[PDB]
Amino acid sequence: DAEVTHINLNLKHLNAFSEALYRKVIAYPADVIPYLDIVVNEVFAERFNRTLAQSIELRPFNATRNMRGLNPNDVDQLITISGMVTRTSSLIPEMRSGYFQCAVCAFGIESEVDKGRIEEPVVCTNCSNTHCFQLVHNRSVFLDKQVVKLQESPDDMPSGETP
Amino acid sequence: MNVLVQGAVHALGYYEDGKYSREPDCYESIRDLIRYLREDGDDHTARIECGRHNLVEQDLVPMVKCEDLTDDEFDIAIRLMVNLCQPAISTMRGKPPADRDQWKMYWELEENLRRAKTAFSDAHFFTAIKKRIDNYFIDTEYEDRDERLRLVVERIVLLIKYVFSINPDTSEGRRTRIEDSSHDRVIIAFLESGIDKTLMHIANQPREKEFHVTILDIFALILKEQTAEDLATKSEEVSTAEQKKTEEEFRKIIENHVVKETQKRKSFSRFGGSYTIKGLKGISANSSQVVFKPIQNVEKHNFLDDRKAKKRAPRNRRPFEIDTNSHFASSEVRGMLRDMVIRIIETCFNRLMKSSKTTVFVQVQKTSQINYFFLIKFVLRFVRLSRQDHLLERISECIGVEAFHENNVQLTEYVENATTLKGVEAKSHGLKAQYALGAYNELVLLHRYIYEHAKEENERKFAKRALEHIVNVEEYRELPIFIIKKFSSSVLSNNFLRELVLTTHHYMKLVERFVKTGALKKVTKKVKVEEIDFQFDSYVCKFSNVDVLKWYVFLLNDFSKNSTELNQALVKMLHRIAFDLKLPIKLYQVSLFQVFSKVNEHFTHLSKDLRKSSRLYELYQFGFHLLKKFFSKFTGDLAIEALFWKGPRECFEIEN
Amino acid sequence: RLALNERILTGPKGISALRETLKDFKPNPKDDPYANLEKLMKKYAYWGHLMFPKMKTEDVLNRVETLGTRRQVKVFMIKHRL
Amino acid sequence: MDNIIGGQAQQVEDTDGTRVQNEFSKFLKSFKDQKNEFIYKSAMKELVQPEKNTIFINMQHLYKFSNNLATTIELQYYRVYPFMCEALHLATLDACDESERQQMFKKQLYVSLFNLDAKTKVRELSADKVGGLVRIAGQIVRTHPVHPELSRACFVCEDCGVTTRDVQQQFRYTQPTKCANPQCMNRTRFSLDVNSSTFVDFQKIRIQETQAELPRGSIPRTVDVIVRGEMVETVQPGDKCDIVGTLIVIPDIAQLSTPGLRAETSNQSEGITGLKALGVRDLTYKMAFLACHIQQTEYLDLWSKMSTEDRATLKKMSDDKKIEK
DNA sequence: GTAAGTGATTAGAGAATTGGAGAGTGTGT
DNA sequence: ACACACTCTCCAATTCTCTAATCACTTAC
Numbered sequence A: 001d002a003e004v005t006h007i008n009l010n011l012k013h014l015n016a017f018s019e020a021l022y023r024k025v026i027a028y029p030a031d032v033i034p035y036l037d038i039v040v041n042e043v044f045a046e047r048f049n050r051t052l053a054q055s056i057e058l059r060p061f062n063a064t065r066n067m068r069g070l071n072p073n074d075v076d077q078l079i080t081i082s083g084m085v086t087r088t089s090s091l092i093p094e095m096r097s098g099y100f101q102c103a104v105c106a107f108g109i110e111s112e113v114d115k116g117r118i119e120e121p122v123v124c125t126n127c128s129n130t131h132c133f134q135l136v137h138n139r140s141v142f143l144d145k146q147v148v149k150l151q152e153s154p155d156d157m158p159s160g161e162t163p
Numbered sequence B: 001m002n003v004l005v006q007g008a009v010h011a012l013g014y015y016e017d018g019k020y021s022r023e024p025d026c027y028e029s030i031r032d033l034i035r036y037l038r039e040d041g042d043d044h045t046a047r048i049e050c051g052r053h054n055l056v057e058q059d060l061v062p063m064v065k066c067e068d069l070t071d072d073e074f075d076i077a078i079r080l081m082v083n084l085c086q087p088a089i090s091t092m093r094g095k096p097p098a099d100r101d102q103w104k105m106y107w108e109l110e111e112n113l114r115r116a117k118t119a120f121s122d123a124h125f126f127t128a129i130k131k132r133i134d135n136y137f138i139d140t141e142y143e144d145r146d147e148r149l150r151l152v153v154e155r156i157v158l159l160i161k162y163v164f165s166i167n168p169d170t171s172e173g174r175r176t177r178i179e180d181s182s183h184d185r186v187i188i189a190f191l192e193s194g195i196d197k198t199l200m201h202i203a204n205q206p207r208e209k210e211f212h213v214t215i216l217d218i219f220a221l222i223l224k225e226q227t228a229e230d231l232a233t234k235s236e237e238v239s240t241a242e243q244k245k246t247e248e249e250f251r252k253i254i255e256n257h258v259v260k261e262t263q264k265r266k267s268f269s270r271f272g273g274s275y276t277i278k279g280l281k282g283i284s285a286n287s288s289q290v291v292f293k294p295i296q297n298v299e300k301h302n303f304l305d306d307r308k309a310k311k312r313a314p315r316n317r318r319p320f321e322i323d324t325n326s327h328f329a330s331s332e333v334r335g336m337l338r339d340m341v342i343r344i345i346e347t348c349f350n351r352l353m354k355s356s357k358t359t360v361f362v363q364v365q366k367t368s369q370i371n372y373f374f375l376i377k378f379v380l381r382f383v384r385l386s387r388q389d390h391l392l393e394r395i396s397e398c399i400g401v402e403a404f405h406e407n408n409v410q411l412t413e414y415v416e417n418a419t420t421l422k423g424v425e426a427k428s429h430g431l432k433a434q435y436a437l438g439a440y441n442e443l444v445l446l447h448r449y450i451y452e453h454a455k456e457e458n459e460r461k462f463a464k465r466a467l468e469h470i471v472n473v474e475e476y477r478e479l480p481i482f483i484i485k486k487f488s489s490s491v492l493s494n495n496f497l498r499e500l501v502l503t504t505h506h507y508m509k510l511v512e513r514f515v516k517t518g519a520l521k522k523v524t525k526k527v528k529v530e531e532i533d534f535q536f537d538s539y540v541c542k543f544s545n546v547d548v549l550k551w552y553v554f555l556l557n558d559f560s561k562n563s564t565e566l567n568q569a570l571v572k573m574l575h576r577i578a579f580d581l582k583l584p585i586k587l588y589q590v591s592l593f594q595v596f597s598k599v600n601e602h603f604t605h606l607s608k609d610l611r612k613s614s615r616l617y618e619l620y621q622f623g624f625h626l627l628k629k630f631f632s633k634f635t636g637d638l639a640i641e642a643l644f645w646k647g648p649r650e651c652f653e654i655e656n
Numbered sequence C: 001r002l003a004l005n006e007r008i009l010t011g012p013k014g015i016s017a018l019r020e021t022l023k024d025f026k027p028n029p030k031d032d033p034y035a036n037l038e039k040l041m042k043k044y045a046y047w048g049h050l051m052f053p054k055m056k057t058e059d060v061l062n063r064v065e066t067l068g069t070r071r072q073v074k075v076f077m078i079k080h081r082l
Numbered sequence D: 001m002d003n004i005i006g007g008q009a010q011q012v013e014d015t016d017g018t019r020v021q022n023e024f025s026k027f028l029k030s031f032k033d034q035k036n037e038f039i040y041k042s043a044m045k046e047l048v049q050p051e052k053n054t055i056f057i058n059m060q061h062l063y064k065f066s067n068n069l070a071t072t073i074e075l076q077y078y079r080v081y082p083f084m085c086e087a088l089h090l091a092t093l094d095a096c097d098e099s100e101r102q103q104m105f106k107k108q109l110y111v112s113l114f115n116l117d118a119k120t121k122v123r124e125l126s127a128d129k130v131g132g133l134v135r136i137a138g139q140i141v142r143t144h145p146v147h148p149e150l151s152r153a154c155f156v157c158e159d160c161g162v163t164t165r166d167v168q169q170q171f172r173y174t175q176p177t178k179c180a181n182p183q184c185m186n187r188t189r190f191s192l193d194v195n196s197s198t199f200v201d202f203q204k205i206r207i208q209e210t211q212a213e214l215p216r217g218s219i220p221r222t223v224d225v226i227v228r229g230e231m232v233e234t235v236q237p238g239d240k241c242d243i244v245g246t247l248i249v250i251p252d253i254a255q256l257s258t259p260g261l262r263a264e265t266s267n268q269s270e271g272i273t274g275l276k277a278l279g280v281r282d283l284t285y286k287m288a289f290l291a292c293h294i295q296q297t298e299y300l301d302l303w304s305k306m307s308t309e310d311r312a313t314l315k316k317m318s319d320d321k322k323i324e325k
Numbered sequence E: 001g002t003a004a005g006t007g008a009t010t011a012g013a014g015a016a017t018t019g020g021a022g023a024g025t026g027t028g029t
Numbered sequence F: 001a002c003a004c005a006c007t008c009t010c011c012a013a014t015t016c017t018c019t020a021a022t023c024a025c026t027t028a029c
């Protein structure tokens, strides 16, 4: 109705439904989140017989710890912490797909950026020259990114620690 | 040396805006320049210095526009202008640049000629030379003519040929395909002067034969950038309809952009990971396949073919196009050219062609052969498409059986020389073969049009006897297989192959009708000559050879940019072997299944209504039926046999 | 140097390996022919990737179609059809 | 025949830019004011003069000529801009004399659009809006001095002496990838020619958020702006201005190594990796606004010129004997 | 008309010419 | 030390020519 594009997923409800799925969500967020999204989009399309401008996106919340209690075991796991916002940065463009153009015959190719890396074409399939393409930056596609700085709450801490 | 050129060049005069002012000793300065050009060596130093100083644009053409210019001043100016407007290969004595350093000098000569062409976008120059032409031909009787004026008139005519044979220029900017060319502005000035009527009047005279070949060359070079389809349709417009049409065009563009961007931005996914495809083996031992992006489903996997660099053919064996600067000119230019074509057909064509055909193949010079075949092809296609049936009397020089005979002789000689020689010489002879083939195709189509739509039964009988001769004699029936077996992309263009496919299509339709009406039953064959029954399926079976079907699968890859006629011709030739000879095993082939895969991917982007509305639906439907016939009895050994071209006993043993 | 040739095409990575790959493939004749073609084409690509990883699938199939004219491959096919 | 003696390739076509070029050419050659005057056909006569490079075009006139043409320009402005400049160049050469076509072949010309009503705030410049036509407002903090900038270049092959023309520059100085002579194998040894190259006047400016934009508890944002040609040095610090143009992305060009330039970091938060020019290094980006038009937001001859309303009201005020109170 | 013998055509192999990829080594930052 | 450019060598593809085998035509009963 209002064309909202996200769902806030309260994880306590999921834990009440099934702990066997809650454990998988918290243990592997970088692998399972790209598919629970697709289940939500499938159910939306089946229910309303309709498409939208962007995919409906998940936001899991209400999974609590302290900033000092983190360990190397917690890398790539889901956590939640709290604090005060002191500073925010200006926006950074982050590319997802580049656009190459041949210098000799103006042919043009797209190329996805993934795993942090782009792949450059070597041979032009039209004019059959080699080491020939140039990236055109403003014909390519970007996304927003922002940095936020967060500060410890002073209440919980043991003796002698600064935030 | 070149201090003499620099002394002579700046001593002529200066162009005020709207007026050229002359020094009194222009005559002796031009004599000295001609003397230096005569004595120039293989370095062409004086010629290159004249090209640096831009004599033709700055001085000589504004000088020729002057009213006070006397006889000798005009004469020697025309002499120098002809010598400077000579083509580059003619300056290099016919040899192409065979060397890294020779090419530099060739390019330096060529750019000076390309720069000079915009000097002739003014009607006053053609008006100035038209008076000298009129003085010799119209105002002087044949008993009283002077050899000095004869030589001057020959120089003027050769100058017009050299002007219209200049190449286009890239340095001025890039121009769209739907506006007037820079060639068209010279054409507008030339036609506004009205000198073309004098040239047509000269061409009509039987007595003045030595100018006729050059006048034929001039009119071919005028029609160089056009096609008959541009001029055949009468021009009309209303601006209301034009505004509505352009708004719908940009509506298409906007909707395409929005759909493409939303699809692309919806494609992306947020996070990563790495995954194993259990059930697919890796290169190293005991390994499963591993992927490093969140794949939707296992069939989306590609084995990283996007990385791998494509293999290339060597530089001697790549396909090449031949580019003619071709555009949809404005309604003004198209109307002027349509009137000129009709006037040529009414006043010149029969006499000009009759005078030319005795001489064009005897001469030392090569290029008039190409001009001859081009003008034949253009005029006959224009008559047939414009349906100006009363003009059919005027082109009666080309309708006889002798036209087919002479064309076939010249085409055969060109094909043999192009196949047997090597290099640029082989490409040069193949270029002649292309134009000869196009003229042959127009001959066939024009004779069918006469036999179908003429009002006089005598004309219908005359056309029918020629058509029967073509269908009967072996030389005309064996020609397509003979050319196809000798085709090679090292020495023949893609335009040649497209032309050959269309020619084969029209010829085979003619043979099918003459069999269906029963007019072809028995056929003469060489041994002595003996007569044997003819079978159309036996004739069609010759084209099922692998050495023919290679090129049809080769040209079917370009389906997304071919014309609809060419797509129809390719699909029809495959459809005959598929469902008239009823032999699908010869078409079961992987390199054709790749084309079907591309067509299917192209059709995925359309709704069920738009698919039936599309222009590629014939190719889609043919691919559907052949693939269903293949998968009706699928086996693994059959899938192995799909990897190779299958000969006759291979087809028998696979079938039985 | 290294190049795809008749030894590799007749070797243990070649036509016999493709036959062993194709033994499990069984399309439905009543289904969409373009869908069945897509299913077949990626099995061709899988065999080509295992057989010669350096080159694209398109160029691999072009090279196989070229090498079918050799007498050694013809003799192999004559034996293999039995 | 001689097309194969030459070695040049066929160029692939952008159909959208081609249609935009054709219709913009018709707009320049056909638009009439209500006075039945050809404003742009008049204005193209002035570009022969040495001081002038730009035509100033009102967007409402484009919308009056054709709705979907202006819609296409606003959506795809960065992609379609060189075609508009090409149409302007050819339409100017149609008007020039033989005396002036000598000069006009080198010269760069610009289109300057103005009078958009679609204002956006400075904080709304997302990465979505790269390449579209946008209006913005701000206060100017700095105005850097003037430099010539290279736009199209000519290079001589050191082996064979052939000139290769119209090498279009990116943000970085670039040499051709291939010699124009088809019988020459050079791809590295080149020398620039100055008297054939074309140079562009350039200026860089910084702007700040106006105070009326600011959210709760917030400090103003700043933007870098690029200006070219006839708009150079038209504005001073402390001014408050409206800008029409497009949003662009510029790279960290110091990370790349090519023929003619090695990397400055080698001489003396994660980026993109993979290019041949980026051996181990990585590339990152910044935002900038490429201005198409800038203006400020708000003696007897001048007195005559402010003729009806202003002279009437101000003369009544001057006659007022209690004007102090 | 049919059968046998001889001639011609087609297929394979060997040798020579042309071109391009790959690897190694040297020089400049 | 690392990157980039240049040069040399080898191998594979193509075309011509010679030799052998198989098929078709001609001759004789």
Ligand SMILES: [Zn+2]
Pocket (backbone or CB within 6 Å): A102, A103, A104, A105, A106, A107, A124, A125, A126, A127, A128, A129, A132
């Ligand atoms: Zn290219």
Ligand SMILES: [Zn+2]
Pocket (backbone or CB within 6 Å): D157, D158, D159, D160, D161, D162, D179, D180, D181, D184, D185, D186
């Ligand atoms: Zn060079």
